[PDB]
Design an enzyme around this catalytic site. Structure first.
Site, short mmCIF file in Angstrom:
data_model
loop_
_atom_site.label_atom_id
_atom_site.label_comp_id
_atom_site.label_asym_id
_atom_site.label_seq_id
_atom_site.Cartn_x
_atom_site.Cartn_y
_atom_site.Cartn_z
N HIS A 143 85.12 40.94 4.86
CA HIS A 143 85.06 42.53 4.65
C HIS A 143 85.97 42.93 3.72
CE1 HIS A 143 83.28 42.40 8.74
NE2 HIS A 143 84.41 41.67 8.80
N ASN A 161 76.84 34.64 10.90
CA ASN A 161 76.22 35.36 10.00
C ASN A 161 74.80 35.09 9.68
OD1 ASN A 161 78.25 37.61 8.80
ND2 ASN A 161 79.36 36.00 9.59
N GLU A 163 76.44 44.39 -16.03
CA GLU A 163 77.17 43.95 -17.18
C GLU A 163 77.04 42.46 -17.39
OE1 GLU A 163 81.30 45.67 -16.92
OE2 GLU A 163 81.88 44.35 -18.55
N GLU A 201 81.15 41.50 -19.12
CA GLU A 201 80.05 41.35 -20.44
C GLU A 201 80.12 40.00 -20.57
OE1 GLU A 201 79.73 44.46 -23.08
OE2 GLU A 201 77.97 43.26 -24.06
N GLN A 255 79.93 40.31 3.01
CA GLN A 255 80.23 41.33 4.35
C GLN A 255 80.48 42.81 3.75
OE1 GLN A 255 82.95 39.74 7.05
NE2 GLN A 255 82.04 37.74 6.72
N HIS A 273 80.86 42.12 -9.23
CA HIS A 273 80.34 42.65 -10.42
C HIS A 273 80.87 41.72 -11.69
CE1 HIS A 273 80.64 45.64 -13.85
NE2 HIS A 273 79.35 45.81 -13.41
N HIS A 306 84.89 38.90 -8.68
CA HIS A 306 84.46 39.59 -10.26
C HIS A 306 84.54 38.47 -11.08
CE1 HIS A 306 84.34 42.25 -13.51
NE2 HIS A 306 84.22 43.42 -12.57
CO LIG Z 1 84.27 40.22 10.61
CO LIG Z 2 83.78 45.22 -13.15
#
Ligand SMILES: [Co+2]
Ligand SMILES: [Co+2]
Ligand SMILES: [Co+2]
Lengths: 208, 208, 208
Positions: A112, A197, A57, A79, A70, A76, A117
């Site tokens: 996690h 990580n 998008e 637009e 994670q 996301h 967004h």
């Molecule tokens: Co953790």
């Molecule tokens: Co979205």
């Protein structure tokens, strides 16, 4: 169910030609993570099971070097270009002189079940805590979003933290957030998480 | 790991005969989404990566035309029939004259990481925001649940919104929620989201 | 995308030799769940789609008999042994006389999209509600975390509940939580959930 979890985005009115992710060879994408579209993933990044990075998008979505996405984290974005070819500037974030829908900096941890967004930017060496949320915001560098905190429609200044559970929706409140200091409980957390990580990414790459 | 992500529900004491999902040919179910059991998915719906629609306890679960079930969203429901064949009416929602465990209306957006848990109903043209939660509630049409809001044990009147972070658990509070008006920040959001997700569903179907 | 969803953990500086999960034959792990590393799953447990149990940092992660790990739930934990072979005792939980990074007791329900992050322990017959969060905490037996509640850095006494939306971060507040009583709305919930999920585990095993 037969599929590729690293895929091009679909053709739409705002996306004339599909793009597929550009992922550094040293990044590890779990087989049960999903990475779609116009995405750039940096070196030594780990993307864990059930994460979904979807740049179909708003685009592009960038994840900088030694960052981690994670389990269950979603990236996301709204637009960025309309059905007219016009770039919707309110939904575009500027970092340095490059335009992104979502920009995740270097050494950033998206813990996690968090979500970032677009339009959104997360500065280097910041920890986004478990179940936290960032949307229509610019989180500075060396910040800490404790678990279940949220930044919506605001700019979080460099070196500040958002207490667990706190949802910050006004610039007035963002300006007065507390500062990360040596004795703050999450003051060294991100560096330790990034070290872990980066090592997990390499260990998992050696099983791939 | 070899499996089908669109599956019948299992035989249990409350489910003598398995049912498999009834999905309109124009809906797109991502390969990394899960849809199990007595589910009806309407036309032009998009189900994104990591969503889980599971109609194995409370059933049926319905998703109306041009609605979207975004990444990581979970639909599930409390048992609707006991081990005696008795329909547990408190866990059953009535929409028009048909009974559902979860009813998602037409043109409804279930944004990333939200959850609607039966008994529950979500009216047409409503936006359920990112990380929001609906359980034991009836959300009216043209509503907006902003990110991280929640409706538990209540009826949200048509055309109202729940501010980001707010958890509404009493009918007294639900009755006084604010109304969506032209100048409200999320007033045109759902229509734009539905337009985008109908186009994404078709684009993704053309890659399938 | 070809993979095994039940996998050994990777070799790292804190994990010289990989371990693979020890899962009772009567447990059901959905094909779209992920279970990695030093994990013990008890009898008649159900692990639902999109759950991620990952014992690669802090370990071991234990899930007791007749417990359930619902859709999208994440179990993970802070490092328990450093790069020196020293056990980081602050990140280790003690249950009886055995050490765990995360201990989920018997008959415990981890409802949809919740997360229990080590160091953490959850006592027998407790319900962890939808979207709830437990981290650096010990949740007693017969407790109820209502949907969207959280326990961070605290010990929740046996038989208490945390109201929906409430984030408990101080021991003073945890000590005064309300008690589960007969007339409390979630007083019989866990037993009913456990009965349902034990039956779902067996039904789903019969499709496997
Ligand atoms: Co953790
Ligand atoms: Co979205
Ligand atoms: Co449920």
């Amino acid at each position: 169910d037969e599929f590729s979890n690293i895929r091009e985005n679909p053709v739409t009115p705002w996306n004339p030609e599909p793009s597929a992710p550009v992922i550094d060879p040293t990044a590890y994408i779990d087989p049960q993570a999903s990475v779609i579209g116009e995405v750039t993933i940096g070196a030594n990044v780990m993307v864990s099971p059930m994460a979904s990075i979807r740049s179909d998008e708003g685009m592009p979505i960038f994840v900088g070097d030694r960052s981690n996405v994670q389990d269950g984290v979603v990236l996301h974005a709204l637009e960025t270009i309309n059905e007219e070819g016009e770039p919707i500037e309110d939904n575009i974030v500027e970092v340095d002189g490059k335009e992104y829908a979502v920009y995740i900096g270097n050494n950033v941890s998206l813990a996690h079940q968090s979500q970032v967004h677009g339009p959104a930017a997360v500065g280097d060496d910041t920890f986004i805590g478990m179940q936290a949320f960032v949307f229509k915001s610019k989180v500075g560098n060396n910040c800490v979003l404790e678990p279940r905190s949220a930044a919506i429609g605001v700019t979080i200044p460099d070196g500040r933290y958002i207490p667990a559970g706190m949802v910050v929706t006004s610039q007035a409140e963002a300006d007065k957030l507390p500062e990360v200091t040596d004795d703050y409980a999450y003051s060294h957390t991100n560096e330790a998480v990034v070290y872990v990580n980066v090592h997990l990414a390499e260990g998992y790459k050696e099983t791939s």
